[PDB]
């Protein structure tokens with residue numbers, strides 16, 4: 001996956017007009033957009049097609065899929081029918097639930113991103129202790145795309161070690177949550193940026209600023 | 218606690234608007250509480266909640282298994298309650314701050330949060346089961362009053378009930394299609410969730426009636 005400037009936009013605005021405007025303002029810097037439930041539940045799944053039509057960008061559906069196998073398959077099918085190129089799935093619910101997603105992705109020509117450890121403080125309670133094992137599970141299942149925390153570079157580094165250099169790794173947490181884009185890119189292929197861009201007085205300048213800081217990478 | 222008719226909640230996971238409406242309408246005389254999840258919402262839109270309210274006036278539990286960071290969880294809950302959902306289901310494994318974010322929005326918006334502790338599928342044994350008791354205890358400490366536990370594991374459902382106490386509200390999926398028994402499930406849960414055993418039956422109404430008949434004494 002060729003992510004322009006190794007920067008993925010987390011478009012979590014909840015208004016179609018604003019989401020489209022801001023995304024358009026940074027289109028010259030980013031060609032990969034992560035769309036989650038904040039926008040989808042506010043504007044509908046048709047927003048994904050609107051983005052591909054307007055920006056011809058790659059779309060990662062960040063739905064943190066975390067249901068039983070049967071329901072997971074339905075969620076993935078509905079998501080890919082909407083035009084998403086990939087979907088993010090939680091690993092905590094187990095191997096069968098992840099496999100269900102992998103099956104639909106293969107069937108519709110899409111990619112599955114396995115979320116191992118999360119970036120927020122609460123991740124330390126239950127997720128962190130199971131993260132390494134979740135990552136190994138991904139390897140065992142043939143998962144090639146992963147999500148790790150920018151807020152804990154040592155943990156992100158460990159995730160990279162487990163999955164190897166061939167696997168693709170994206171990471172949220174830089175900016176608003178305290179992570180550093182440059183440090184994150186020492187281990188992740190691409191850094192995710194939401195508020196640091198869409199909540200900035202000048203989103204375009206914010207995006208340009210982030211890229212300027214990692215220009216040597 | 219919500220008064221769930223016949224202690225039976227319909228898991229409406231059909232992905233077709235017409236079929237979902239037909240089936241739900243056919244069993245309305247037996248069920249007044251419907252669980253709507255992403256299979257239907259991602260296929261027909263959040264307005265499906267509005268249509269169910271208008272057509273059936275049934276209570277709506279949005280099964281979105283919210284599992285994001287606090288900031289995003291808050292937005293998901295706000296959008297969901299704005300759409301008309303009476304309650305939303307949230308995962309406890311992401312931690313206390315993520316759950317608290319949902320509780321705060323529910324409190325501010327006058328709605329309810331259901332905390333999913335242990336799940337019913339086989340994969341739940343890998344990571345969730347080992348953290349389930351603590352997740353439940355965390356819920357109690359946070360003031361959570363509504364919970365979700367597995368019908369497929371009576372022993373686990375029983376322990377969950379003990380942890381949350383008799384005053385807490387507990388609903389449980391897994392009976393029927395996944396192998397659980399409605400009767401046994403209701404020994405610990407306030408209401409049992411039923412999806413495929415009802416919506417895939419040739420006669421959903423008869424299926425619902427059959428399930429209720431087997432638990433009439435309860």
Ligand SMILES: O=C1CC(=O)N([C@@H]2O[C@H](COP(=O)(O)O)[C@@H](O)[C@H]2O)C(=O)N1
Nearest residue numbers: 010118119172176177193194195286289
């Ligand atoms: O561990 C994780 C996973 C994840 O997807 N995310 C998402 O990544 C984005 C981060 O946005 P922000 O840059 O903090 O504003 C949001 O859409 C989150 O829901 C996260 O922050 N942490």
Ligand SMILES: O=C1CC(=O)N([C@@H]2O[C@H](COP(=O)(O)O)[C@@H](O)[C@H]2O)C(=O)N1
Nearest residue numbers: 068071228336337390394395411412413
């Ligand atoms: O542990 C859990 C949680 C849950 O919500 N569910 C949901 O409960 C319903 C069960 O449906 P079914 O009766 O097996 O067809 C589905 O909507 C599932 O996504 C589950 O099966 N197990």
